[PDB]
Amino acid sequence: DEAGITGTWYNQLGSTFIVTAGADGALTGTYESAVGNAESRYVLTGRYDSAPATDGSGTALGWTVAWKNNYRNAHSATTWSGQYVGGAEARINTQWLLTSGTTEANAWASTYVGHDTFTKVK
Amino acid sequence: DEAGITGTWYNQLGSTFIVTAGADGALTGTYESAVGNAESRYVLTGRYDSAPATDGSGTALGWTVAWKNNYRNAHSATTWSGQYVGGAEARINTQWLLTSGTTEANAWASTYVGHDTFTKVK
Amino acid sequence: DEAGITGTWYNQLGSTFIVTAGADGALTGTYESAVGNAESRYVLTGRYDSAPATDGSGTALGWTVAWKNNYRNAHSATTWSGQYVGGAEARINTQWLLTSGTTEANAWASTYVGHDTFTKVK
Amino acid sequence: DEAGITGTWYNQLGSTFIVTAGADGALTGTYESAVGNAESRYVLTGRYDSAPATDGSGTALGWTVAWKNNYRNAHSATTWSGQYVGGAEARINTQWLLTSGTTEANAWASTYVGHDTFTKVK
Ligand SMILES: [C-]#N
Numbered sequence: 001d002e003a004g005i006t007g008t009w010y011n012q013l014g015s016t017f018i019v020t021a022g023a024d025g026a027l028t029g030t031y032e033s034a035v036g037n038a039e040s041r042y043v044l045t046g047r048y049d050s051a052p053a054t055d056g057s058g059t060a061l062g063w064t065v066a067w068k069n070n071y072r073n074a075h076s077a078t079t080w081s082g083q084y085v086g087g088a089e090a091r092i093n094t095q096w097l098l099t100s101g102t103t104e105a106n107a108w109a110s111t112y113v114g115h116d117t118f119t120k121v122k
Numbered sequence: 123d124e125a126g127i128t129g130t131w132y133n134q135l136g137s138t139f140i141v142t143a144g145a146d147g148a149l150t151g152t153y154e155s156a157v158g159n160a161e162s163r164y165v166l167t168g169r170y171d172s173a174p175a176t177d178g179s180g181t182a183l184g185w186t187v188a189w190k191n192n193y194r195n196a197h198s199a200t201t202w203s204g205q206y207v208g209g210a211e212a213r214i215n216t217q218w219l220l221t222s223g224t225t226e227a228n229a230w231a232s233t234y235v236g237h238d239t240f241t242k243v244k
Numbered sequence: 245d246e247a248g249i250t251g252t253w254y255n256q257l258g259s260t261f262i263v264t265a266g267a268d269g270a271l272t273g274t275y276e277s278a279v280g281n282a283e284s285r286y287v288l289t290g291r292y293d294s295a296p297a298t299d300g301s302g303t304a305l306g307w308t309v310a311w312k313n314n315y316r317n318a319h320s321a322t323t324w325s326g327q328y329v330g331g332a333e334a335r336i337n338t339q340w341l342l343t344s345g346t347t348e349a350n351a352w353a354s355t356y357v358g359h360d361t362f363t364k365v366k
Numbered sequence: 367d368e369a370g371i372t373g374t375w376y377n378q379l380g381s382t383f384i385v386t387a388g389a390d391g392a393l394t395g396t397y398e399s400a401v402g403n404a405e406s407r408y409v410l411t412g413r414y415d416s417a418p419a420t421d422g423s424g425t426a427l428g429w430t431v432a433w434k435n436n437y438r439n440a441h442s443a444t445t446w447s448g449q450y451v452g453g454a455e456a457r458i459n460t461q462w463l464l465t466s467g468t469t470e471a472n473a474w475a476s477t478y479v480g481h482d483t484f485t486k487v488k
C-alpha cells in the first residue's frame with residue numbers, strides 16, 4: 001500500500017495531508033488544518049503496516065503533528081490512528097487525540113478526541 | 123525540553139520507550155510492549171512542541187508505533203498523545219489509540235483507547 | 245429539544261435507538277445494535293441539557309447501554325457522548341466508549357472507541 | 367456486585383460519585399465535580415452488567431451526567447465507561463467523554479477524553 005498511501009489526502013473539514021510512505025513503514029509529510037489555531041504546513045511523521053493481512057483487512061497506520069511551525073505555536077499535538085482502505089474510492093478512516101500543554105490543575109481537560117475521514121478528492 | 127524528553131521511559135504496564143528529541147521537534151526511537159501481540163523493539167516516530175509555554179504548562183507531544191518488526195506483525199498501530207511534565211519526578215502523561223486493520227464489517231471495533239503514564243524509573 | 249430528541253433514531257451501522265426525553269433532562273429507551281455480540285433490545289438511560297445555549301449551539305447529551313438482556317450477556321457497556329443538532333435534517337453526532345469486563349492483565353485492552361451519527365430516516 | 371457498587375466513590379481529582387445499583391442493572395445517583403464549570407450535585411443515570419463473568423473479570427458499567435442543575439448549566443455532558451473491580455481495594459476504572467454543545471464550525475473540538483479511577487476512600 002506504499003503506492004496507495006503516498007500522495008495528497010483531504011478530510012471532511014477541508015484539511016490537506018501530504019504523505020510519503022517508505023518501504024520500511026515510514027510516514028513523512030506535511031499537514032495543513034482548515035480549522036483551529038493553525039496556519040500553513042506542519043511536519044508530520046508516523047508509521048504504517050507495510051505487510052498487511054491479505055484477507056481484505058485495511059492497513060493500520062498513524063501519525064503525529066506538533067502544532068508549531070515558523071508562523072504559529074498552538075502548544076499542542078494531534079495523533080491520528082486509523083486504517084487505509086484501498087479500491088475505487090480509497091479512504092483513510094482515523095480517530096485522533098489532540099493534547100494541549102496544560103498546568104497540572106487543567107490536565108483533566110488536556111485532550112480532545114475526534115474522527116477524520118481522508119479521501120483522494122475534494 | 124529536548125534534554126528532559128531524550129532517554130528511557132517505563133509505563134505502568136512495564137513497557138520501555140527509548141526516544142531522542144531533536145532540536146527541530148522530531149521524536150525517534152523504539153518501543154517494547156510488556157503486553158499484547160508484541161515482542162522485542164518496534165520503530166517509533168513522533169513530534170513534540172520544542173518551544174512550550176513558560177507558564178509551567180507541560181510540553182505537548184505524540185508518537186506512533188506500527189506493530190511490525192522482523193519477529194511479528196500484529197496488523198495494528200498505536201498513537202500516544204500527551205504532555206511531558208518536568209521537575210523532580212518527570213512524567214509523560216498519555217492517552218493512546220490502537221487501531222487494527224479490519225474488514226469494513228468489523229471496522230466499528232477497529233480501535234482501542236487507553237492511557238499510559240511514563241516515568242524515568244521502575 | 246424534548247420534542248426534537250424523543251423518538252426513533254438510526255445510525256450508519258443500521259442500529260435503532262428509541263428514546264424519550266423528559267422535561268427534567270432524563271433519557272430512557274432501548275437500543276438495538278445491528279453489529280457485535282447483541283440481539284433484540286437493551287435498556288438505555290442517559291441525560292441531556294434541557295436548557296441549551298440560544299446561539300445555534302447543539303444540545304449536549306449521553307446515554308449508556310449494558311449489553312445484558314434476557315437473550316445474551318456480552319459483559320460490556322457502551323456510553324455515547326455527543327450533541328443533538330436540530331433543523332430540517334436533525335442529527336445526533338456521538339463518540340462512544342465500549343468497555344468489556346476483563347482480568348487485570350487484559351485491562352489495557354478493555355475499551356473500544358468509535359463514532360456513530362444518528363438520523364431520523366434510513 | 368449490586369452491593370459492591372452501591373455507595374460513595376471518590377476519584378483522583380477529589381470528585382464525589384454517589385450511586386445505587388439496582389437488581390435490574392440500573393445505576394442512579396449524583397455526581398459532584400471538584401473541577402471545571404460545575405458546583406454542587408448533578409443527577410446521573412447509567413447501567414451495569416448485573417450478571418458478570420465468574421472468571422475474575424471486572425463488571426462492565428457506564429453512566430452519564432448532563433452538567434445542568436439549579437445552580438449552573440455548562441451545556442455539556444460526560445459519560446464514564448469502565449469496569450468495577452471488587453476486593454480489599456475495590457476500584458471503578460473508567461474512561462470518559464465530555465461533549466459540549468457547539469456550533470457546526472466548532473464541532474471538531476466538541477469532545478474531551480480522559481480517565482478517572484474511583485476508590486471507596488480519599
Ligand atoms: C478552551 N475552551
Ligand SMILES: [C-]#N
Nearest residue numbers: 222231344353
Ligand atoms: C477480541 N478481539
